[PDB]
Amino acid sequence: SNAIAVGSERSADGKGMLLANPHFPWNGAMRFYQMHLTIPGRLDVMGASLPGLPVVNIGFSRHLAWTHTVDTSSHFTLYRLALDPKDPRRYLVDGRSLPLEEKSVAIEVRGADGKLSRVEHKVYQSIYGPLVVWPGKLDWNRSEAYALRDANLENTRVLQQWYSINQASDVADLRRRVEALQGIPWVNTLAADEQGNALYMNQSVVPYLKPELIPACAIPQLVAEGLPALQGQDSRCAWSRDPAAAQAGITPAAQLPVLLRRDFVQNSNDSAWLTNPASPLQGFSPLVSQEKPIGPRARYALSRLQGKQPLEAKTLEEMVTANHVFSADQVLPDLLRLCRDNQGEKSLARACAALAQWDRGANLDSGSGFVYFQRFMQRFAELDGAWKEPFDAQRPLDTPQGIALDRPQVATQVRQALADAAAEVEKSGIPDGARWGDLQVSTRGQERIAIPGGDGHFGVYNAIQSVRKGDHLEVVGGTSYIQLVTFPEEGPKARGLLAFSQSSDPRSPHYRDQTELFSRQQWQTLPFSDRQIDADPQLQRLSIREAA
């Protein structure tokens, strides 16, 4: 997910502006759906929502626009259990042996013959929650097991929270409503209002441990590997209570990152840290936000956002529709130098030619260089110390960069990686002359619609994730609901698309219409006022009722 909010100090019109670019599945229980909700006099909000939810999840109203991005905060903890040496179904807390709880679930299974059979399965639970096993990493042996406590299992406030957001007037109001309820499960919130405020909130439901508990309660080797793992044999490692928190055991709103500014804030799924580099957010719990190197999408955004020049709506739009593969900025110049140093290496000829011709984009018309580059990057990413300039915490926006071609060992390994990638690409059945749009598609009935964009890990802001299906790459997720909002005098102006179209049903008139527009990167007005709605030549109306 990407999000950018721009305030009065940087917007061309001196008001607020918001780009919403969540990256979500193109099918299933998280498929976005556009809708506009009005209870006259007290609710009027438009945007998109997830299946089954009677609220708008990402959207805008008369003076406000808001969106979300998946955050880096932990929303659960693992507990390492010390098992009773006499009994692997018992575990020790404060030296006392407690029994696991067993709860059977019964499931009906349809067989070959079409008859139903009953399956009964035991789910073991500890005082923390259910036990979980990752074979080879988180086992359940005679010494230890792992339980999982999910902070959102007790979050009964989640629907209320977006009901409340849907009623928010401006950025200040939105912030109050979110901090009050703390019902947001696992996303950041970014917003802008007409008055020119830009807001970032890492305000979600996060397990709370008082600072003095963390060094003692962590499992050092597991947390070093990215897992929020705690000592489950010590009752003091229970999530801490703070009466200010909306839910027992979660982090109070005052200790979660918030940045209110009038220039900009951005997020592309890194931590709160460099939301705006001019005002770094640090000093939070490791469960909440850490100072880690940012990914290429955020680095790309910051490269466009920093400076003194005004930001226009078209500027934010084109950050998405440019399809620029920002990772190429870091490695392609030096890679091309390597290519030029190895003319005569026949095996590298086609790859180097393709990489040199390439527009460094993931456009429909982008050449095979993108495919060569992806396969190379995959291998580059597993090399050790190949960066010319390694990540530097004092230069986190400009590092890492370049290839260390002046180190013979690096030069040899990088050439091998290119050699390997070249053969792989040429081993594939992909015809010479094929462009990216020939390969990456979304199927609609009998047609395959070419889809621009590429994987977020290569620094493409317009992130698109695909899987191989026969002769093509089938889109499974990525850029989904797009919303770009500004606040001219007449009312909010909102522009965008639902990339995969409103209806998942092939019979619908709205099964592929926005997908064709997405292919051509032609965003559209999102009509909000009664006058905009009535100006629509295809306007349809139905009133329905029934007794309660």
């Binding site: 599945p25 099918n27 299933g28 229980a29 998280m30 556009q34 809708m35 506009h36 909700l37 009005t38 209870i39 006259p40 438009m46 089954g52 939810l53 009677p54 929303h75 179904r89 499931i107 009906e108 299974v109 349809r110 067989g111 399956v119 399965h121 789910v123 073991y124 259910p130 979980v132 096993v133 990752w134 074979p135 005679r142 959102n152 009964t156 989640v158 629907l159 209320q160 009901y163 499960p185 639902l498 179209s501 409103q502 209806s503 049903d505 019979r507 619908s508 008139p509 709205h510 559209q524 009509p527 709605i533 295809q538 349809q540 109306r541 139905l542 009133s543 329905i544 009722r545 029934e546």
Partner: protein
């Protein structure tokens, strides 16, 4: 006397604009409009969240999250136990209860009248009237996507050791 009522306008690309005088009517319009576009999707995901995939589709299939049907079912049967749904419902405000009540009613109203114009799964046994509990099941499924949901296979796999060395 008042009951459920909604006014719906659709603009280009099939975007609904729902107007109502209260949350119940608002939900009614949302559920109806969503069903018109996505009844089969919601019906499938409700089967998943009820833990009934293997019952309708057997053990060799997967959910749309690419979990095997039986492990998915065990996980959602565990997640969405009656006591848990009841507690979640009890904690809801009147406004949210009304939104959910309206949504279910509006979805069901579309289902009663559907003749297949925009619904490909007409006649399937898993396409059926929904209840507010089904919407709670979907909500809880989304709730844990950043937590125990990512460990669904791992929860199903968790069993105590035998007598191995």
């Amino acid at each position: 006397p008042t009951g459920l009522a909604a006014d719906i306008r659709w603009t280009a690309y099939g975007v609904p604009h729902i107007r109502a005088k209260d949350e119940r009517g608002l939900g009614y319009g949302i559920g109806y409009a969503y069903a018109r576009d996505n009844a089969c999707l919601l019906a499938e995901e409700i089967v998943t969240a009820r833990g009934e995939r293997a019952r309708y589709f057997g053990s060799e299939g997967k959910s749309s999250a690419e979990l095997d049907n039986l492990p998915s079912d065990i996980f959602y049967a565990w997640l969405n136990q009656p006591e848990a749904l009841q507690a979640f419902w009890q904690a809801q405000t009147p406004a949210v209860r009304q939104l959910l009540e309206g949504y279910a009613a509006g979805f069901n109203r579309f289902l009663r009248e559907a003749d297949g114009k925009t619904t490909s799964c007409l006649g399937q046994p898993w396409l059926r009237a929904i209840a507010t509990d089904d919407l709670l099941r979907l909500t809880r499924r989304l709730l844990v996507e950043g937590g125990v949901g990512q460990f669904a296979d791992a929860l199903v796999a968790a069993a105590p050791p035998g007598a191995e060395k």
